[PDB]
Design a protein around this ligand. Structure first.
Ligand SMILES: CC[C@H](C)[C@@H](c1cn(CCCCN)nn1)n1cc(COc2ccc(C(=N)N)cc2OC)nn1
Ligand SMILES: [Ca+2]
Length: 223
């Protein structure tokens, strides 16, 4: 997260960190047993870390659970990142508390101009490398399709949307991938790609979660 702010310990209880020796992606808890993330976060042997703030200190509220299953969307394309969505089953259930709680799936798509909360432990610098101790937060609106497609000619599909700031300065970055875009208590986006970080006329692109609510539900029911 570039140009964001410190969320505060467990103010974002559905945020998880995906760890493979190191934090490499975020994710969202949707029930006691499942995580929504980005398909391009797939790795063998992921460990899911819930209840985290300082990801570099054992602080007491953390839960550490291995991924038992890792389901990439069957139409995912890693060249274009269309259908960039993945579901992670926890080998055991998460103990839901005030520090650790799930996020609702959308009943309907959000619309351009809606304000959202983007969070994660990714890079906090444009043109550099500086990953944070504590979870970072960003307030950011869904942008219009015409803004998105003029920012990214010939690259935006019906399963993506832009959000953030055309002026730049404030954006998600490397390390936030798979992380939540929450708008009005609903999980509407997944941190996906972007051209650089926080640069002018290069907003972030996000997986349009509302297009997948039936997939998520059937997949949870079949596994
Ligand atoms: C795990 C996939 C991939 C292998 C890996 C990765 C690491 N490097 C090298 C970095 C050196 C420069 N620091 N290249 N690809 N990766 C990609 C991402 C997502 O990246 C972005 C997300 C959002 C935005 C946004 N403007 N909103 C921008 C993003 O990047 C432009 N995170 N890790
Ligand atoms: Ca911790």
């Amino acid at each position: 997260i570039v140009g964001g702010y410190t969320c505060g310990a467990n103010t974002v209880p559905y945020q998880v960190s995906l760890n493979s020796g190191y934090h490499f992606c975020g994710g969202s808890l949707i029930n006691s047993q499942w995580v929504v993330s980005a398909a391009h976060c797939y790795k063998s042997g992921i460990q899911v870390r819930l209840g985290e703030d300082n990801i570099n200190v054992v602080e007491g509220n953390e839960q550490f659970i291995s991924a038992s299953k890792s389901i990439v969307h069957p139409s995912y394309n890693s060249n274009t990142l269309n259908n960039d969505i993945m579901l992670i089953k926890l080998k055991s259930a998460a103990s839901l508390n005030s520090r650790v709680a799930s996020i609702s799936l959308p009943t309907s798509c959000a619309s351009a101009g809606t304000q959202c909360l983007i969070s994660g432990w990714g890079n906090t610098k444009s043109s550099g490398t500086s990953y944070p101790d504590v979870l970072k937060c960003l307030k950011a609106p869904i942008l219009s399709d015409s803004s998105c497609k003029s920012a990214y000619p010939g690259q935006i599909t019906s399963n993506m949307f832009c959000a953030g700031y055309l002026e730049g300065g404030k954006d998600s970055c490397q390390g936030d991938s798979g992380g939540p875009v929450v708008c009005s208590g609903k999980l509407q986006g997944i941190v996906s790609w972007g051209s650089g970080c926080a640069q002018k006329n290069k907003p972030g692109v996000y997986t349009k979660v509302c297009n997948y609510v039936s997939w998520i539900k059937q997949t949870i029911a079949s596994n």
